[PDB]
Amino acid sequence: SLAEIRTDFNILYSMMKKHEEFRWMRLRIRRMADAWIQAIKSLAEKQNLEKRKRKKVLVHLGLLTPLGELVQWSDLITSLYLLGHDIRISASLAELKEIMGGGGVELIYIDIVGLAQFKKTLGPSWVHYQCMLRVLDSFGTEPEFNHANYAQSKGHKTPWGKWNLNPQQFYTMFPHTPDNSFLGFVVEQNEIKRQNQSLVYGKVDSFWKNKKIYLDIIHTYMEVHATVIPSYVKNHGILSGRDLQFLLRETKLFVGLGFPYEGPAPLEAIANGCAFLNPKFNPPKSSKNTDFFIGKPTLRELTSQHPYAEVFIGRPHVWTVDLNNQEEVEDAVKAILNQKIEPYMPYEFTCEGMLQRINAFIEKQDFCHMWPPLSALQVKLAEPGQSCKQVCQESQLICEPSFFQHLNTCQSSELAKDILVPSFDPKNKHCVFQGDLLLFSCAGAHPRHQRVCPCRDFIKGQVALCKDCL
Ligand SMILES: CC(=O)N[C@H]1[C@H](O[C@@H]2[C@@H](OC[C@H]3O[C@H](O)[C@@H](O)[C@@H](O[C@H]4O[C@H](CO)[C@@H](O)[C@H](O)[C@@H]4O[C@@H]4O[C@H](CO)[C@@H](O)[C@H](O)[C@H]4NC(C)=O)[C@@H]3O)O[C@H](CO)[C@@H](O)[C@@H]2O)O[C@H](CO)[C@@H](O)[C@@H]1O
Ligand SMILES: *[C@@H]1O[C@H](CO)[C@@H](O)[C@H](O)[C@H]1NC(C)=O
Numbered sequence: 089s090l091a092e093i094r095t096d097f098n099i100l101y102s103m104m105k106k107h108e109e110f111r112w113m114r115l116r117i118r119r120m121a122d123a124w125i126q127a128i129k130s131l132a133e134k135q136n137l138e139k140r141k142r143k144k145v146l147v148h149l150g151l152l153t154p155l156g157e158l159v160q161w162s163d164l165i166t167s168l169y170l171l172g173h174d175i176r177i178s179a180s181l182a183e184l185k186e187i188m189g190g191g192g193v194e195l196i197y198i199d200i201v202g203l204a205q206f207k208k209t210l211g212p213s214w215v216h217y218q219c220m221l222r223v224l225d226s227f228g229t230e231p232e233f234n235h236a237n238y239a240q241s242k243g244h245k246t247p248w249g250k251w252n253l254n255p256q257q258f259y260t261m262f263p264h265t266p267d268n269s270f271l272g273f274v275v276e277q278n279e280i281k282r283q284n285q286s287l288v289y290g291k292v293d294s295f296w297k298n299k300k301i302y303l304d305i306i307h308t309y310m311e312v313h314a315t316v317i318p319s320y321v322k323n324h325g326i327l328s329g330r331d332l333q334f335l336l337r338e339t340k341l342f343v344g345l346g347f348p349y350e351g352p353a354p355l356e357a358i359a360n361g362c363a364f365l366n367p368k369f370n371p372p373k374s375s376k377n378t379d380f381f382i383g384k385p386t387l388r389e390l391t392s393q394h395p396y397a398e399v400f401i402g403r404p405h406v407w408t409v410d411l412n413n414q415e416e417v418e419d420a421v422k423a424i425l426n427q428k429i430e431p432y433m434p435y436e437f438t439c440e441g442m443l444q445r446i447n448a449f450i451e452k453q454d455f456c457h458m459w460p461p462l463s464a465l466q467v468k469l470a471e472p473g474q475s476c477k478q479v480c481q482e483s484q485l486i487c488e489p490s491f492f493q494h495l496n497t498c499q500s501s502e503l504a505k506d507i508l509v510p511s512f513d514p515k516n517k518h519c520v521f522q523g524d525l526l527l528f529s530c531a532g533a534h535p536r537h538q539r540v541c542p543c544r545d546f547i548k549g550q551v552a553l554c555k556d557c558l
Contacts, residue, residue, distance in 0.1 A: 150202025228265030435549030
């Protein structure tokens with residue numbers, strides 16, 4: 089029974105009308121419907137989408153039993169629907185039991201809250217389905233937090249970790265954690281734009297605490313608008329849809345205050361021709377120094393409010409600035425004021441880019457027992473203090489953790505259960521090899537030794553996929 093692409097949303101709307109929380113998701117799908125339908129038709133012309141098996145897919149939304157996560161769920165469901173899969177949407181324990189009770193489930197999209205429910209509801213046979221799980225986890229899960237016993241040994245108290253999955257089963261909001269898979273979402277998209285209009289990113293007064301100098305510098309050159317705080321700020325209150333599309337289409341500069349971290353909104357601003365003023369974090373913010381991140385299953389350090397925007401887009405669309413550097417902020421605002429407007433969206437955040445990525449994952453990513461192909465492997469040695477993530481990135485590659493097993497001249501050697509191996513002491517030519525295959529980790533820098541690191545190429549604008557991965 090083969091998957092046939094769908095070009096009509098009538099059935100999708102009927103499914104999402106069964107859950108009150110999808111109300112504004114259905115609205116957004118209608119706004120984006122022509123983009124989605126154009127994209128599934130264009131993909132089907134570029135690539136053979138024939139002879140794909142129709143999968144029975146459980147989509148269990150633990151969080152419905154977070155706007156960015158609701159957007160990601162909406163875009164995932166829409167992608168599955170367009171690709172012709174048999175979607176069973178669950179937002180209750182009752183639904184979960186019924187769907188799994190019926191059997192034939194081939195693929196499971198769930199969040200970590202939903203996974204706790206899955207385990208509790210199904211009992212010990214929950215692990216029978218473990219290889220079919222794709223776990224929507226916005227901020228990502230590094231191997232040291234996923235391995236229950238290693239995490240306990242290191243004193244990690246995360247309520248989110250210790251699931252003992254293959255870490256590539258965690259599906260992230262941005263491609264920030266190469267131990268994981270990047271799922272993302274779709275970003276909704278010069279006489280319109282008011283050259284001197286800036287708009288503050290942040291719907292609560294709390295976000296604005298101790299930003300006055302920053303805002304005062306911006307206010308020297310631009311009107312400061314808000315949707316929520318100095319007297320001069322022009323507040324439009326809470327908005328949406330066409331209205332917010334208009335306000336962003338009207339705005340030259342979208343102003344970050346530091347929070348929230350890694351949201352969709354800066355990408356929507358850039359897609360609508362805005363530049364993003366992106367606060368720089370020195371030191372970088374992590375579960376080690378930031379209350380928001382304490383208990384999150386990663387030590388990943390954020391170098392700015394939106395590191396994807398900073399690293400994968402950059403100027404002129406994204407100015408990553410020290411808020412405390414008055415010279416730097418003024419230079420940035422004056423630059424943006426004089427910039428030519430260039431609306432931009434990375435391919436991977438388009439309808440067709442997301443359809444291509446999720447179709448590849450559905451067809452090629454299998455944890456139930458080779459992809460990416462071993463031809464993609466390029467091995468790099470991380471210097472001491474450098475992670476496998478870093479040394480791949482430094483060569484315009486990305487760490488590919490599925491190649492660690494193929495990397496596991498050595499005068500002596502030993503075995504260790506540690507996220508930092510395989511390692512090489514090139515002084516005494518001593519090799520330490522991985523003794524616990526669940527501890528293979530792109531994340532982590534050896535303090536003394538070189539790390540032996542598995543990298544792969546990526547399609548520019550589609551970092552989730554190697555050139556030979558389609
Ligand atoms: C959307 C999402 O999950 N996104 C990210 C996530 O982001 C964080 C997350 O926080 C969700 C939690 O927020 C509050 O702490 C609570 O509302 C909590 O709800 C549980 O706990 C409260 C009491 O604290 C209860 O009132 C509520 O019923 C619920 O109880 C819990 O129920 C579950 C289901 O059975 C049970 O399994 C738990 O044991 C039980 N917990 C307790 C202690 O009783 C929320 O869970 O979402 C926020 C926005 O919604 C974000 O800002 C947060 O950063 O982060 C993770 C990890 O990084 C990521 O994987 C995920 O994608
Ligand atoms: C910004 O420019 C527009 C037109 O160029 C004008 O209407 C507006 O008054 C200006 N704002 C400030 C604060 O000077």
